[PDB]
């Protein structure tokens, strides 16, 4: 059955999360679409670029090098709608600012819109992890910003207690 979601917590009507990898949500679900947290050449060396890359045997990877090499580079905050490959029936590739790498943090509304041109969606907490943006804050541009349904996977169980301890607030 495709979007098959289990054992979310509903934090409004179109915002959902689960403590998990998303690799492993992407392989249960059969999502219509996957959300990488991309940058902007399409590069997945690491994070969970690298582990969606990975679960692909790099089909992903060849892919995404062919792409850049006929439309370029992404913007920060944009994003490209490739294949899902054996994980979903498309991967949105969106670009969350790297607050760690000086880009601004105004842009995090700018990526979670890219969400809103589909109507389901797994995906992993834009600008968090080792991209350096505060990821209470994240999910609070997530709720705010997009309106079709999303479903976050946040493979931390103590990050995750503590964004449904701040939303519930
Ligand atoms: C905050 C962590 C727990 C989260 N990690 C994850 N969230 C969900 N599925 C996952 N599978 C694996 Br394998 C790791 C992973 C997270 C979310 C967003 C970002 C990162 C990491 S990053 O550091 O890769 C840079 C890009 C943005």
């Known amino acids: 059955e495709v979007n098959s979601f289990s054992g979310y917590l509903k934090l409004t009507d179109n915002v959902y999360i689960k403590n998990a990898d998303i ?3 992407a392989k249960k679900v059969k999502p219509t679409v996957v ?6 050449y399409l590069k997945h060396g690491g994070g969970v670029a ?3 890359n990975k679960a692909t045997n790099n089909a992903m990877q060849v892919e995404s090098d062919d792409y850049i090499a006929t439309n370029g580079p992404l913007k920060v905050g944009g994003s490209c709608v490739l294949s899902g ?3 979903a029936k498309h991967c949105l590739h969106v670009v969350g600012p790297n607050v760690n790498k000086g880009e601004d943090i105004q842009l995090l509304k700018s990526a979670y819109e890219n969400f809103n ?3 389901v969606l797994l995906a992993p907490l834009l600008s968090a992890g080792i991209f350096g943006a505060d990821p209470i804050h994240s999910l609070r541009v997530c709720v705010d910003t997009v309106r079709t349904n999303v479903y976050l996977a946040v ?3 103590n990050l995750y207690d503590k ?3 701040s939303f519930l607030e």
């Open 35 to 40: 959300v990488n947290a991309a940058n902007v």
């Open 50 to 52: 690298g582990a969606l």
């Open 117 to 119: 041109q589909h109507e």
């Open 23 to 25: 690799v492993e949500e």
């Open 155 to 157: 493979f931390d169980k």
């Open 163 to 165: 964004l449904v301890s």
């Open 85 to 87: 490959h054996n994980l």
